[PDB]
Structure 1
């Protein structure tokens, strides 16, 4: 639904790299370069953003 606040495997906090991730992808950067530029070294953190599906943007579209 919404970005997890901390990575499940190592509790690294990834809940503040969602908008930065989206901004570096709009600038032309690959998902690899983008996840690198955010400080996500070990692949347990990289999967936390790489495979996130933001469904809070589709629920926030039905009437109040």
Structure 2
């Protein structure tokens, strides 16, 4: 399951921000700071980028 594109609530393009979010989380950054660094002022996009689970890795492995 890849990151859901277009952010159903309010319709925001967030399909190309998952890699940046992972890179920010790899460093000494919290979830809130990482989401703020991606220029997201509405909590719908933050919820979409925070509640996603990476499932395609298990699909490829298994």
Structure-2-length-normalised TM-score: 0.95
1:60 corresponds to which residue? Answer: 60
1:5 corresponds to which residue? Answer: 5
Structure 2 unmatched ranges of 5 or more = none
CA distance in 2, matches of 1:12, 1:55: 22
The answer to which structure has the higher helix fraction is 2
Q: CA RMSD in A?
A: 0.7
Structure 1 unmatched ranges of 5 or more = none
How many residues matched?
Answer: 62
- Structure 1 runs of 4+ with >2 Å offset: none
